[PDB]
């Protein structure tokens, strides 16, 4: 059993590469951000990117972005930005590449759906005219990155219900298999009923996904940072109320 | 202001093309299902047909689903399968093009497709418009001039548009809605999905606050499409929605309106 929170990641100085994955609508941008905005308060800056080809950095922040960086509206630290690159993976490779040497300390990375992320993960192994191997060096190198485990993360997020805990097995799993590291897990949209409250469907929903936690407890308690988010009355909007969430990740809303 | 219902679409013979979007996770699939069992109720044949890169038709229905098509249990009426199909997208659609017109001349009477994000339906019709060997550049003509004749038909295709009442996807079903518009496409439905009424006589904060919420929203729907959408409403329920039996239940809503006071 770890904290049950983001702290580690705080911690983690090393850190270059933070991808947060999971199924669509779990709820992936709003922590992306989330966790930016708390990184950014302890790292020198942190560029939030998104590749999601429908993008909502912009609606999460209220403020339009592209494919140029800029800074946050409401911070000095923290910048975004919105874009989109057998051979799509190819495009990618060259954005990660030329970011990652750029002056930002971290990087938190919003995308496509644990479907594209993996495709392209699986790639490098897929390849197995001196332009060929230019190609080959540099994915390796990139490749290599996402192995050491001082530079790159996963954090999974995902709901309590069948379909999206399905899909953090098997990503968690690939992930394995890849040799890319991963230990965290924002379990989000929880309900806890209001103490005090008698009220069958609250009840009942707690109840129903309680049921879920529990387990994803006992499978990873002892070795992912399991968080936990409770889902809030209105959508997570506004640099205010994202910084807000973003409190919770890092210190266990127990109610 | 037209029935909150997809009586019409039940109605709708001619209907060969019913895809259902939305965005991720707003419960796309779990409708398909359900109107795909409800078709099948009137309909000679349904095939329910998955392009996701993903697999949710057989955890829908607890089934294992293949390339090949499938009945699915419990039916002998209704058939589902999955699979996954010098310019990038364009491979892409080259692709999808390719398996409606092959399974555009199996018996299935009526097809409910499941998809590719938003994005990915989006790619394909961006790409029209814009769009013994090589003598095949005329074949490929040919398929997309007809497939993309059947888009504009609206005897053919519809569009149902999924979503709930939260900021991020009604403001897809509006986009999505008008590029249909823009492309001349048809459609007249909205599922709005996963409502949630307090039950009557519980005051309980949470659920009011929410229904507070949601209603907000809700009535804009309204008001914008009522005249010419069939707005569905769905209830939120306790448990997923899986099962055939589970599913069933539901897809009823889907035709005959939840309508608790
Ligand atoms: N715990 C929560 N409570 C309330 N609203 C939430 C919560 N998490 C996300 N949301 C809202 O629901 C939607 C889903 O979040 P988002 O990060 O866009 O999911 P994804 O990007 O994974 O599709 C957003 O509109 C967000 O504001
Ligand atoms: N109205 C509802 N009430 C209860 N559960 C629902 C409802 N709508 C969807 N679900 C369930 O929520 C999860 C996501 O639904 P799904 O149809 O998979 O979304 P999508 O296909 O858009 O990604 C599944 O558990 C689905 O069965
Ligand atoms: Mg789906
Ligand atoms: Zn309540």
Same mark, same amino acid.
């Given at each position: $059993?770890? =904290?049950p929170t983001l702290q580690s990641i705080l911690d983690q100085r090393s850190l270059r590469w933070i991808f947060v994955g999971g199924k669509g609508g779990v709820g992936? +941008?709003? +922590? $992306?951000? $989330?966790l930016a905005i708390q990184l950014a308060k302890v790292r020198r800056s942190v560029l939030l990117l998104s590749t999601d080809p429908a993008h909502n950095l912009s609606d999460a922040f209220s403020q339009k972005f592209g494919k140029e960086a800029r800074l946050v509206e409401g911070f000095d630290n923290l910048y975004a930005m919105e874009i989109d690159p057998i051979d799509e993976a190819m495009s990618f490779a060259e954005v990660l590449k030329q970011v990652n040497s750029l002056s930002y300390e971290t990087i938190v990375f919003d995308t496509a759906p644990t479907g594209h992320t993996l495709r392209f993960?699986?790639?490098? +192994?897929?390849? =197995?005219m001196e332009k060929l191997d230019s190609l080959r060096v540099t994915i390796s190198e990139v490749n290599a990155q996402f192995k050491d485990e001082r530079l790159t993360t996963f954090v999974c997020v995902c709901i309590p219900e069948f379909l999206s805990l399905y899909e953090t097995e098997r990503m968690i799993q690939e992930l394995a298999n890849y040799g890319i590291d991963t230990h965290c897990i924002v379990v989000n949209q929880l309900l806890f009923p209001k103490p005090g409250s008698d009220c069958e469907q609250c009840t009942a929903r707690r109840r129903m996904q309680k049921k879920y936690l529990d387990q994803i407890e006992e499978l990873y308690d002892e070795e992912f940072n399991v968080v936990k988010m409770p889902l809030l009355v209105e959508e997570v909007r506004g640099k205010e109320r994202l910084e807000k969430f973003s409190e919770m990740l890092i210190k266990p809303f127990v109610p």
């Amino acid at each position: $059993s770890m =904290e049950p929170t983001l702290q580690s990641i705080l911690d983690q100085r090393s850190l270059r590469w933070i991808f947060v994955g999971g199924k669509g609508g779990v709820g992936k +941008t709003t +922590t $992306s951000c $989330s966790l930016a905005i708390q990184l950014a308060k302890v790292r020198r800056s942190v560029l939030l990117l998104s590749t999601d080809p429908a993008h909502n950095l912009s609606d999460a922040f209220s403020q339009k972005f592209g494919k140029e960086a800029r800074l946050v509206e409401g911070f000095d630290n923290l910048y975004a930005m919105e874009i989109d690159p057998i051979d799509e993976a190819m495009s990618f490779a060259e954005v990660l590449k030329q970011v990652n040497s750029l002056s930002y300390e971290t990087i938190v990375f919003d995308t496509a759906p644990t479907g594209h992320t993996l495709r392209f993960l699986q790639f490098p +192994t897929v390849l =197995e005219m001196e332009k060929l191997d230019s190609l080959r060096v540099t994915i390796s190198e990139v490749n290599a990155q996402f192995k050491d485990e001082r530079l790159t993360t996963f954090v999974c997020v995902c709901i309590p219900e069948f379909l999206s805990l399905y899909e953090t097995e098997r990503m968690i799993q690939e992930l394995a298999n890849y040799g890319i590291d991963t230990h965290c897990i924002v379990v989000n949209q929880l309900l806890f009923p209001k103490p005090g409250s008698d009220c069958e469907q609250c009840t009942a929903r707690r109840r129903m996904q309680k049921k879920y936690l529990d387990q994803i407890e006992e499978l990873y308690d002892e070795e992912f940072n399991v968080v936990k988010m409770p889902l809030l009355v209105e959508e997570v909007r506004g640099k205010e109320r994202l910084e807000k969430f973003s409190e919770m990740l890092i210190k266990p809303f127990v109610p």
